[PDB]
Design an enzyme around this catalytic site. Structure first.
Site, PDB file in Angstrom:
ATOM      1  N   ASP A  63       0.834  -1.226   0.000  1.00 42.40           N
ATOM      2  CA  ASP A  63       0.000   0.000   0.000  1.00 42.40           C
ATOM      3  C   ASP A  63       0.877   1.288   0.000  1.00 42.40           C
ATOM      4  O   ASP A  63       0.691   2.174   0.840  1.00 42.40           O
ATOM      5  CB  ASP A  63      -1.044   0.033   1.146  1.00 42.40           C
ATOM      6  CG  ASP A  63      -2.286   0.885   0.852  1.00 42.40           C
ATOM      7  OD1 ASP A  63      -2.249   1.704  -0.117  1.00 42.40           O
ATOM      8  OD2 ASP A  63      -3.291   0.746   1.587  1.00 42.40           O
ATOM      9  N   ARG A  91      -0.378   9.080   1.125  1.00 40.07           N
ATOM     10  CA  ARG A  91      -1.214   8.963   2.333  1.00 40.07           C
ATOM     11  C   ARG A  91      -0.586   8.018   3.390  1.00 40.07           C
ATOM     12  O   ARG A  91      -0.849   8.199   4.571  1.00 40.07           O
ATOM     13  CB  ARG A  91      -2.637   8.481   2.003  1.00 40.07           C
ATOM     14  CG  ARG A  91      -2.705   7.025   1.560  1.00 40.07           C
ATOM     15  CD  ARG A  91      -4.111   6.535   1.267  1.00 40.07           C
ATOM     16  NE  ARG A  91      -4.071   5.366   0.380  1.00 40.07           N
ATOM     17  CZ  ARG A  91      -3.932   5.440  -0.938  1.00 40.07           C
ATOM     18  NH1 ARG A  91      -3.828   6.619  -1.542  1.00 40.07           N
ATOM     19  NH2 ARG A  91      -3.869   4.331  -1.664  1.00 40.07           N
ATOM     20  N   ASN A  92       0.200   7.008   2.966  1.00 36.25           N
ATOM     21  CA  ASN A  92       0.851   6.041   3.866  1.00 36.25           C
ATOM     22  C   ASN A  92       2.369   6.358   4.046  1.00 36.25           C
ATOM     23  O   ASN A  92       3.190   5.471   4.307  1.00 36.25           O
ATOM     24  CB  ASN A  92       0.607   4.606   3.407  1.00 36.25           C
ATOM     25  CG  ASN A  92      -0.862   4.318   3.287  1.00 36.25           C
ATOM     26  OD1 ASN A  92      -1.684   4.723   4.124  1.00 36.25           O
ATOM     27  ND2 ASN A  92      -1.237   3.700   2.193  1.00 36.25           N
ATOM     28  N   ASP A 113       4.776   1.453   7.887  1.00 36.36           N
ATOM     29  CA  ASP A 113       5.129   0.045   7.760  1.00 36.36           C
ATOM     30  C   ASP A 113       4.203  -0.832   8.609  1.00 36.36           C
ATOM     31  O   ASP A 113       4.663  -1.759   9.288  1.00 36.36           O
ATOM     32  CB  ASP A 113       6.606  -0.147   8.169  1.00 36.36           C
ATOM     33  CG  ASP A 113       6.998   0.451   9.510  1.00 36.36           C
ATOM     34  OD1 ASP A 113       6.113   1.012  10.201  1.00 36.36           O
ATOM     35  OD2 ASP A 113       8.186   0.398   9.851  1.00 36.36           O
TER      36      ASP A 113
END
Length: 259
Positions: A121, A125-126, A139
């Site tokens: 992903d 945003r991450n 993570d």
């Protein structure tokens, strides 16, 4: 477990299930997440015990004795990279900073690549932002490659299409080269300052467009060398995409040249 800690040792400050807290005995500001698929999240948290990198969100502790369960990480003061890029002063957050953030992310990804981990992903945003344009990749969903180069997600799993590689969309197959594709979309995000990928393109038509070699346009002001890297990430064949060792080397060179 060395990772297991006392629930009373954390004080909750602000709601951001995820809170800004304080590890009282260390006077350290932390991020605490409170927990059906609860046991899956604890398994994903156990993976974080194995990784240590300056550009990956640091696991600090865990509370897995009584409900609710706590997962404690380092606190990232400026939130996610998507909201950061959209709300920043672009005179401060210039080309060099854009270059510094990509070097930081590819560094994290070269480590995971070497340690045989899969992100699944990778998006702005991450990515979490600290002070002075510090970027640490989130993570919290890493998959270790136990056997072989390719991970197969369970049939009937939904993915963020605009970031998902063609083989992942078509066959649920994920590799570090599928993370290289998702990294390319993240470069487009950095280059456009948090603009949505494939603007206005109907989600149900993305896979068929990619099949016919359709790729996103080169953002305004985006260096040709960086667009070439974006394009190299978006090769149809996973074998044709560069390594994260190749990507980090190019970015570290481009950021050193920029100085």
């Amino acid at each position: 477990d060395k990772w297991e800690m006392e629930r009373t040792d954390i004080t909750m400050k602000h709601k951001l299930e995820v809170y800004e807290g304080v590890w009282k005995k260390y006077s350290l500001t932390v991020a605490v997440k409170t927990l059906m698929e609860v046991e899956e999240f604890l398994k994903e948290a156990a993976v974080m015990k194995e990784i240590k990198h300056p550009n990956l969100v640091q696991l600090l502790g865990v509370c897995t004795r009584e409900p609710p369960f706590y997962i404690i990480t380092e606190f990232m003061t400026y939130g996610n990279l998507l909201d950061y890029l959209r709300e920043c002063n672009r005179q401060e957050v210039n080309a060099v900073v854009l270059l510094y953030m990509a070097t930081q992310i590819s560094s994290a990804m070269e480590y995971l690549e070497k340690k045989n981990f899969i992100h699944r992903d990778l998006a702005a945003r991450n990515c979490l932002v600290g002070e002075n344009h510090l970027v640490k990749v989130a993570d919290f969903g890493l998959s270790r490659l136990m056997t072989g180069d390719t991970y197969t997600a369970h049939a009937g799993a939904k993915f963020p299409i605009k970031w998902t590689a063609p083989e992942s969309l078509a066959y649920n197959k994920f590799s570090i080269k599928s993370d290289v594709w998702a990294f390319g979309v993240l470069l487009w995000e950095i280059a456009t300052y948090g603009m949505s990928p494939y603007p206005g393109i109907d989600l149900s038509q993305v896979y068929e467009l990619l099949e016919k070699d359709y790729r996103m346009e080169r953002p305004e002001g985006c260096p040709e060398k960086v667009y070439e890297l974006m394009r190299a990430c978006w090769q149809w064949n996973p074998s044709d995409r560069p390594s994260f060792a190749e990507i980090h080397q190019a970015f570290e060179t481009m950021f050193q040249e920029s100085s």
